[PDB]
Amino acid sequence: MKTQVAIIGAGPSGLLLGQLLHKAGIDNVILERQTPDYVLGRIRAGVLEQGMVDLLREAGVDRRMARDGLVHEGVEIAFAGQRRRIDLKRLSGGKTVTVYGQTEVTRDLMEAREACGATTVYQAAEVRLHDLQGERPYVTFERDGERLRLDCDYIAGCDGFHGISRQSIPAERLKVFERVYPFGWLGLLADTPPVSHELIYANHPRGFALCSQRSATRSRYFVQVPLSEKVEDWSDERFWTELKARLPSEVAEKLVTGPSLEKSIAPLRSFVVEPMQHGRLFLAGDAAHIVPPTGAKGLNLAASDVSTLYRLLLKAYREGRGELLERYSAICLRRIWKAERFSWWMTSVLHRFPDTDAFSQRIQQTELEYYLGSEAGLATIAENYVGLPYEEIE
Amino acid sequence: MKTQVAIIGAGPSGLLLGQLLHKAGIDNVILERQTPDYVLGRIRAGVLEQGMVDLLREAGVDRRMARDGLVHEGVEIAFAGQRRRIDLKRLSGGKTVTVYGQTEVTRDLMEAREACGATTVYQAAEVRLHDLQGERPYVTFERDGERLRLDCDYIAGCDGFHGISRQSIPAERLKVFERVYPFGWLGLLADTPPVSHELIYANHPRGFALCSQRSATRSRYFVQVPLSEKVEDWSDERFWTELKARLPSEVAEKLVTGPSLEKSIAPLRSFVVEPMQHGRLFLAGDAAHIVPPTGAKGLNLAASDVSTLYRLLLKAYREGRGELLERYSAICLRRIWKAERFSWWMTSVLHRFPDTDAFSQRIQQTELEYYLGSEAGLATIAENYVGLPYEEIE
Ligand SMILES: Cc1cc2nc3c(=O)[nH]c(=O)nc-3n(C[C@H](O)[C@H](O)[C@H](O)COP(=O)(O)OP(=O)(O)OC[C@H]3O[C@@H](n4cnc5c(N)ncnc54)[C@H](O)[C@@H]3O)c2cc1C
Numbered sequence: 001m002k003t004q005v006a007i008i009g010a011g012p013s014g015l016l017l018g019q020l021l022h023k024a025g026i027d028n029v030i031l032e033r034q035t036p037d038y039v040l041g042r043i044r045a046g047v048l049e050q051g052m053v054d055l056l057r058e059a060g061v062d063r064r065m066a067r068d069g070l071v072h073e074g075v076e077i078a079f080a081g082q083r084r085r086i087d088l089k090r091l092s093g094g095k096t097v098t099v100y101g102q103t104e105v106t107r108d109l110m111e112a113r114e115a116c117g118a119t120t121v122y123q124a125a126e127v128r129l130h131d132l133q134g135e136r137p138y139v140t141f142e143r144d145g146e147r148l149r150l151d152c153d154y155i156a157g158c159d160g161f162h163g164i165s166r167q168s169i170p171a172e173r174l175k176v177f178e179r180v181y182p183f184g185w186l187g188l189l190a191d192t193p194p195v196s197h198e199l200i201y202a203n204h205p206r207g208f209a210l211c212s213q214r215s216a217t218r219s220r221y222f223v224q225v226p227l228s229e230k231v232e233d234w235s236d237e238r239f240w241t242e243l244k245a246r247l248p249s250e251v252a253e254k255l256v257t258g259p260s261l262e263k264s265i266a267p268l269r270s271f272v273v274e275p276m277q278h279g280r281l282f283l284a285g286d287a288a289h290i291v292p293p294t295g296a297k298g299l300n301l302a303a304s305d306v307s308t309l310y311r312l313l314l315k316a317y318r319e320g321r322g323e324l325l326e327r328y329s330a331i332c333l334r335r336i337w338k339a340e341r342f343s344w345w346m347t348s349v350l351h352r353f354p355d356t357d358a359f360s361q362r363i364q365q366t367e368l369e370y371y372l373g374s375e376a377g378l379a380t381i382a383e384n385y386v387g388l389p390y391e392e393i394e
Numbered sequence: 395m396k397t398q399v400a401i402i403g404a405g406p407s408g409l410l411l412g413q414l415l416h417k418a419g420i421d422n423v424i425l426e427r428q429t430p431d432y433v434l435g436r437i438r439a440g441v442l443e444q445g446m447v448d449l450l451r452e453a454g455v456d457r458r459m460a461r462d463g464l465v466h467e468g469v470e471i472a473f474a475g476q477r478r479r480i481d482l483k484r485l486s487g488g489k490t491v492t493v494y495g496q497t498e499v500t501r502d503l504m505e506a507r508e509a510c511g512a513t514t515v516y517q518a519a520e521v522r523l524h525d526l527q528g529e530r531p532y533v534t535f536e537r538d539g540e541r542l543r544l545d546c547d548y549i550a551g552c553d554g555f556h557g558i559s560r561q562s563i564p565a566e567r568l569k570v571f572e573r574v575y576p577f578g579w580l581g582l583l584a585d586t587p588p589v590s591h592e593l594i595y596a597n598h599p600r601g602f603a604l605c606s607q608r609s610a611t612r613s614r615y616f617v618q619v620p621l622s623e624k625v626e627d628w629s630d631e632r633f634w635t636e637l638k639a640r641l642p643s644e645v646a647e648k649l650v651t652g653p654s655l656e657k658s659i660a661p662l663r664s665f666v667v668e669p670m671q672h673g674r675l676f677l678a679g680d681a682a683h684i685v686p687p688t689g690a691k692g693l694n695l696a697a698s699d700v701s702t703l704y705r706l707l708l709k710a711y712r713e714g715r716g717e718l719l720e721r722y723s724a725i726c727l728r729r730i731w732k733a734e735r736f737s738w739w740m741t742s743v744l745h746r747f748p749d750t751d752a753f754s755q756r757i758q759q760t761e762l763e764y765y766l767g768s769e770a771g772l773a774t775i776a777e778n779y780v781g782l783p784y785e786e787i788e
């Protein structure tokens with residue numbers, strides 16, 4: 001086979017880049033290791049920046065999101081009994097965030113790609129990338145036992161943290177920056193109405209807790225948990241009791257509980273590689289970077305990498321300006337590092353870190369008191385939470 | 395002897411509290427371990443908040459400060475080649491800071507106390523504090539071999555970090571919060587004109603550097619130095635070469651160097667005790683807390699503790715409301731912890747910390763890029779730098 005852009009991975013990154021590119025007339029073939037059902041089983045993210053919302057609109061995949069997505073105008077941070085509201089809309093100059101599940105975004109995109117007849121190969125086994133520095137790079141994969149070859153101009157590695165694309169770059173051309181946190185989040189999806197119309201992040205002596213949602217009758221809750229915890233040690237009931245013990249009484253009292261639809265533990269990590277490209281191969285999303293979920297930036301960074309790779313490729317094809325693609329990593333890294341810094345700070349102030357001395361505990365408490373009580377402090381969280389502006393270029 | 399308020403220490407804290415109290419009609423006796431000359435030899439601080447300026451005016455000790463003090467409207471932070479200016483006046487809503495040396499403030503105050511005839515006992519040896527919980531606490535000291543007793547109503551411990559007043563509180567009534575940094579500052583006073591009309595804080599791969607001043611022909615420079623450094627290993631010339639190597643070229647080029655009037659190394663520390671009182675004894679300034687010098691908050695916290703202890707005592711005597719003095723530590727601690735947080739952050743972003751991994755280095759660089767390029771980021775530094783409002787009470 002032959003295509004113009006080969007996309008490895010059919011998660012949100014690959015599908016968005018795929019849709020945008022197709023609508024613009026740049027053929028693209030997506031290769032995905034799992035089946036469609038497997039991909040749709042992943043719960044994941046729930047908070048979308050205005051920027052990602054506008055990108056779904058541009059791919060023309062926003063009908064259901066505009067219908068069912070919920071626009072949030074603020075978030076609440078609870079600490080030491082207090083519950084402070086950050087008016088995102090007011091403090092950001094009118095921007096807001098949208099709650100629409102990643103599973104749903106992935107669904108909308110997959111449906112859109114089918115309807116337009118673009119190519120997607122599922123169960124593409126053993127994908128290998130070749131001649132990344134040549135003028136004619138290519139991908140080989142196995143489909144029902146036989147090895148096939150796809151020739152393309154460029155390759156977009158949208159295959160997540162464990163994807164083959166980042167491992168295909170000679171290790172010596174890359175610089176890795178990583179911090180592993182000593183805790184993870186234990187998450188629970190329940191078919192129950194949410195405890196608040198906005199999200200609640202809670203710093204409690206017992207450990208972090210987060211009250212989120214997917215819609216008016218679907219909730220998502222998280223508790224900080226030690227790295228040794230196994231999910232089978234957490235019955236629905238043990239979870240509910242722990243969530244309640246970490247929330248302020250007036251909130252824990254209104255909480256409608258119920259059996260879990262899904263329960264899973266996800267460790268926290270910060271990861272960035274520089275550069276994010278090598279020859280004809282460009283990494284986007286989780287393939288190039290990981291942020292802890294505290295700032296809801298994962299799916300949002302993937303969107304910005306994609307919006308960026310797309311606009312550069314658009315220039316490369318429609319305008320013949322292929323030299324602009326060298327600017328990908330620089331553009332992307334500026335936004336990435338700021339979101340990494342925001343996620344890191346958020347994680348630092350909301351979580352209970354082990355073996356922490358008295359001074360640092362007081363500093364953490366004072367960080368919250370200052371930032372949540374200063375108009376300038378609130379504006380720094382707010383502008384970062386809704387999402388900093390996407391870069392332009394030319 | 396007998397007095398109403400016994401003040402231990404004749405540094406800035408003791409003298410300010412002493413002057414304010416005298417002018418209001420509350421007699422006070424100051425006890426100081428060293429001689430006046432010894433006290434006046436200490437170089438120390440140079441940056442005063444508006445709040446401390448107004449306090450010097452209230453003690454009526456501002457003639458020379460208004461004359462010779464310099465009002466700074468901004469500071470500059472240099473990192474990665476760039477030189478960013480934080481317009482303090484604009485971003486703080488019109489507040490500024492004043493550069494007038496601590497030695498000079500101490501001088502002005504000492505002169506004022508002499509002229510008014512208030513009591514100050516120098517070379518007061520072996521000061522001991524007694525009956526702190528009684529109704530009649532007292533201080534004993536040795537003056538030329540003989541032991542004397544001073545009876546008072548209250549005792550203000552303004553004796554610095556190594557003073558006797560904090561050690562007089564039963565250790566079990568106090569909670570200490572401390573962080574020791576793995577570096578100190580090597581400072582140099584030179585009779586040369588300053589390299590800028592405003593201060594310059596510099597983060598350089600080689601370590602922190604600060605360009606400060608005392609007047610139009612007197613400069614003060616600092617370099618971060620390892621905890622093992624001995625001042626005798628730093629000749630004037632070695633210092634100048636190191637300062638230059640840490641500043642941006644256009645600044646290092648304008649630098650007028652010269653022999654040092656004074657050279658000394660001061661380690662960095664964060665220290666807070668809670669509470670700041672015990673019975674009839676109240677701690678103020680360095681006796682109760684230490685901040686690293688990066689945020690210029692030391693002398694400024696001492697001033698606010700003093701402004702607070704004074705207004706409470708004023709109520710106690712002139713209005714009979716002595717129950718208000720129990721509110722001292724709470725009022726003081728609110729302002730103290732925020733300044734501790736600001737000093738800690740400042741130190742964290744401007745200094746080169748040993749054994750630092752790649753991720754943290756990038757986060758530090760990104761902290762600066764974000765805060766110095768966001769209007770909300772700049773406002774958080776600015777409002778904190780000029781000084782957060784003093785609390786009111788009643
Ligand atoms: C398990 C996990 C849980 C998360 N939970 C949350 C959460 O609760 N909240 C939140 O805010 N953020 C969360 N995130 C972050 C957010 O969901 C991600 O940043 C986002 O999915 C990024 O999308 P992506 O398309 O770049 O990669 P992914 O969504 O991971 O998709 C990449 C795709 O590439 C495929 N692939 C992998 N290897 C190959 C191969 N060799 N060949 C072909 N295809 C391959 C994968 O099967 C997958 O379909 C989570 C991330 C992970 C990994």
Ligand SMILES: Cc1cc2nc3c(=O)[nH]c(=O)nc-3n(C[C@H](O)[C@H](O)[C@H](O)COP(=O)(O)OP(=O)(O)OC[C@H]3O[C@@H](n4cnc5c(N)ncnc54)[C@H](O)[C@@H]3O)c2cc1C
Pocket residue numbers: 402403404405406407408425426427428433438439440496518521552553554555556557558581660678679680681687690691692693696
């Ligand atoms: C050595 C050092 C260097 C500093 N350098 C800087 C600098 O470069 N820049 C900056 O911003 N900040 C600096 N600071 C911070 C700032 O100068 C202080 O926070 C400030 O001096 C606080 O004033 P104070 O009156 O509370 O205590 P101090 O000024 O320390 O004065 C307390 C006084 O109490 C006296 N005393 C001690 N023990 C007894 C006793 N047993 N009986 C009676 N009297 C006693 C002392 O002799 C001293 O006179 C420095 C602090 C120190 C200690």
